[PDB]
Design a binder for this molecule. Structure first.
Ligand SMILES: *[C@@H]1O[C@H](CO)[C@@H](O)[C@H](O)[C@H]1NC(C)=O
Ligand SMILES: *[C@@H]1O[C@H](CO)[C@@H](O)[C@H](O)[C@H]1NC(C)=O
Lengths: 371, 98, 98, 49, 159, 53
């Protein structure tokens, strides 16, 4: 139903790319991750790999499996076998084509692995992963209970309208396994189904473009003296930086990508309610955070004297409150405001003396001046 | 590496300004890849150093709301009022209790 | 943003020529003396007289449509107030500018 | 959140004093659970300090 | 032998509860952890889960398996399949009914998982785990050699 | 990491062993990285050879 589910997958085909470490050294594996985005506030990761999955080799809709280019052939394994982690194992959420949506924790790098029919293969790429917790409270995992605040998260819906990327025909793919010295001469299989592009640096015949024919090549002592490329010219590939381009032409178009970042609602912790102690032109606040929580305060005067601090350990702080007004915001709790008025000792009759020092506290900045 | 390294006149505008200090490097011998040099995304750096918002810092208890960009409950100043009321709406004392 | 990187233009036993490309912050450079390798073996026979052209450009991120900052300039602000005015037992909801 | 938030006259005493600032919260729509708010165990905080 | 090993398990039956994340979103799974205690000084964790294990569906003593309520039915799988971790994989020590004793390392949250007959299920709950090292020396793991000092630890005995 | 844990699956419950040893590898160069970059310059270093020689 619709080209979004039909997918350009039928046109593309997964491909291979170099990984920094494949276990014992580097290799040209399809698991290679092209790019990673970490803009979602909920901690989900959107990985772009060199392979494609969600549709099988025949183009049928099957999200249970994943498709990887195993050297000269293409194999498919169940998606549930594929695992990935950064500091701890991640949870795969969804996938479509090149892109993968998973719940990864914080970490310094992303490692993805899957079990082949042999020793398991893995690949790690350096990328800073650090998701901003939703809200003014810095949590590691979402709480059981909380208030609903607006956030931006990666939608799992395959619906795609805005974003798109450029894909184009891949370049010539060298394959030295095509060529051998049958008895003493260069012999190359096409093979059955692929056109064999062969060119020699030495003299004689330097162009083959052999579609389907077993040919012998003289004046080539060793098979190292020749080079051979597999040409498909049937499908497009993502504009990857690890596969060489075709020099003849770059047939290209625009193709949309899944897992768009979209607005949503998130569950956030609620900063514990502090204890409030009253006094003369002063409020005593007993803070007891469950996690690092930002405390922000301001006055309602012309001089706000804005003060803020991330507080993770219990502590009691005192702030001065004038009749002009003082606002209080604590984590995700709705902002509260408190004003101040004449507390004590005031200005009673108190004859004599006494009232002089009582007036000292009322309307300061002067008082002593008049005396 | 600064806020606004990538600018676009409008959301739908295809033309855009880019200043990333992109420098190409020498590739590794025997390895096919496209080496490059670029400044870190200034958007991310600004997001990290974004500082408290105007909504939290605005004086006079002014509250800031978005979409129809507006300021509310700004307790500063005073507003004069003029009331042109017709005499027909006035009531004579003889109709009111004494 | 995302750094758009084109596929390497690798010419075996020869030399390429670079051409202007009209992309934001578009960089292109020619590299010589490369012997690329692939999963299927050595890509190019020759050890010298080899050319590997690397091209890259800067493009907007696909997430930018939803997650972006908008820079505005503001001036000459006007205030709109909502006053509940009752004049002689006439309660109304008034939306009026200042 | 302070040392002695939960007090008991004796070890075997069933009656006890509790001051945890327990506040019930609004549950999530479509989810069965008992939301709550409480101060961190003052015993643990004191043990740390 | 004795009601402690007979267990009220025969009277109870495991149950299901909501987890914050079950992989792709929340769910009502029996793996849900009700509470976690971390008072032992040796680093062992005592988890209370919504399911029960140690006795099979018929009430026979079998510690090799664990019992979980799979929606409308109740299924059992070997206990050795069940794994859990906080920062690194934990080592399960013992279990009885609702409670689980395991050697977990330090971490910010506890994740428990097991393989079903289908995609593996997991559940993470936020709880501060930070075990105080025994003695005046702050170590991560116990040393090969040392002196014997008094401490308080979770006994594995079902008594 | 702060310690090294090694484990393998027997024919029964898996066996593991942890030993305390400070593990902290000095990044190569004047830049303190966690993992090697995709691209960079070649500088001299000292590494463990895998050769059985
Ligand atoms: C304010 O702080 C001081 C010490 O920092 C404390 O002695 C005083 O009691 C506090 N004020 C109130 C009203 O608690
Ligand atoms: C003024 O407005 C509020 C709601 O805007 C209304 O509840 C109240 O009754 C009104 N009072 C008078 C005196 O009109």
């Amino acid at each position: 139903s619709t080209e979004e589910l039909f997918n350009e997958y039928k046109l593309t085909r997964p491909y291979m790319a170099r990984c920094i470490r494949c276990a014992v050294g580097s290799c040209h594996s399809p698991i290679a991750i092209e790019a990673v985005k970490s803009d979602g506030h909920d901690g989900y990761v959107r990985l772009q790999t060199s392979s494609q999955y969600g549709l099988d080799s025949s183009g049928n809709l099957k999200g249970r499996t994943m498709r990887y280019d195993m050297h000269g052939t293409i194999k498919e394994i169940p998606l549930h076998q594929v695992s990935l982690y950064t500091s701890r194992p991640c949870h795969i959420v969804d996938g479509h084509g090149y892109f993968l949506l998973a719940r990864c924790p914080a970490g310094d790098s992303i490692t993805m692995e899957f079990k082949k029919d042999s020793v398991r293969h893995s690949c790690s790429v350096p990328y800073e992963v650090k998701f901003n917790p939703v809200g003014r409270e810095l949590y590691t995992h979402p709480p059981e209970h909380g208030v609903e605040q607006a956030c931006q998260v990666y939608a799992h819906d395959a619906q795609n309208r805005g974003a798109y990327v450029e894909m184009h025909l891949p370049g010539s793919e060298v394959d030295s396994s095509l060529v051998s010295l049958s008895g003493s001469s260069v012999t190359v299989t096409p093979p059955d189904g692929t056109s064999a592009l062969v060119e020699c640096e030495c003299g004689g015949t330097k162009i083959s473009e052999t579609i389907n024919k077993t040919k012998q090549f003289s004046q080539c002592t060793k098979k190292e003296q020749c080079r051979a490329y597999r040409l498909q010219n049937d499908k497009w590939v993502y504009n990857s930086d690890k596969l060489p381009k075709a020099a003849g032409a770059t047939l290209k178009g625009k193709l949309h990508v899944p897992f768009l970042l979209a607005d949503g609602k998130c569950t956030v912790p609620l900063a514990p309610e502090p204890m409030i102690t009253f006094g003369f032109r002063s409020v005593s606040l007993k803070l007891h955070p469950k996690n690092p929580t930002y405390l922000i305060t301001r006055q309602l005067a012309d001089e706000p004297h804005y003060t803020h601090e991330l507080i993770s350990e219990p502590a009691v702080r005192n702030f001065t409150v004038t009749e002009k007004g003082w606002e209080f915001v604590w984590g995700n709790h709705p902002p509260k405001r408190f004003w101040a008025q004449e507390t004590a000792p005031g200005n009673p009759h108190g004859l004599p003396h006494e009232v002089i020092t009582h007036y000292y506290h009322r309307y300061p900045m002067s008082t002593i001046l008049g005396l | 590496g600064a806020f606004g390294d990538i600018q676009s006149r409008t959301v739908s505008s295809s033309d855009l300004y880019a200043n990333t200090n992109l420098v190409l490097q020498r590739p590794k011998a025997g390895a096919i890849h496209v080496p490059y040099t670029q400044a870190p995304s200034g958007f991310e750096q600004w997001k990290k150093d974004k500082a408290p918002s105007l909504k939290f810092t605005a004086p006079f208890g002014c509250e800031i709301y978005t979409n129809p960009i507006r300021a509310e409950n700004c307790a500063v100043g005073s507003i004069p009022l003029a009331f042109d009321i017709p005499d027909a709406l006035f009531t004579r004392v003889s109709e009111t209790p004494t | 943003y995302k750094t758009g990187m084109d596929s390497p233009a690798i010419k075996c036993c020869g030399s390429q020529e670079c051409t202007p490309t009209y992309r934001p912050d578009e960089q292109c450079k020619v590299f010589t003396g490369v012997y690329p390798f692939m999963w299927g073996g050595a890509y190019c026979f020759c050890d010298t007289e080899n050319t590997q052209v690397s091209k890259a450009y800067v493009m907007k991120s696909d997430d930018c449509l939803a997650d972006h900052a908008e820079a505005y300039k503001a001036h000459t602000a006007s205030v709109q107030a909502f006053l509940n005015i009752t004049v002689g037992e006439h309660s109304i909801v008034t939306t009026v500018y200042v």
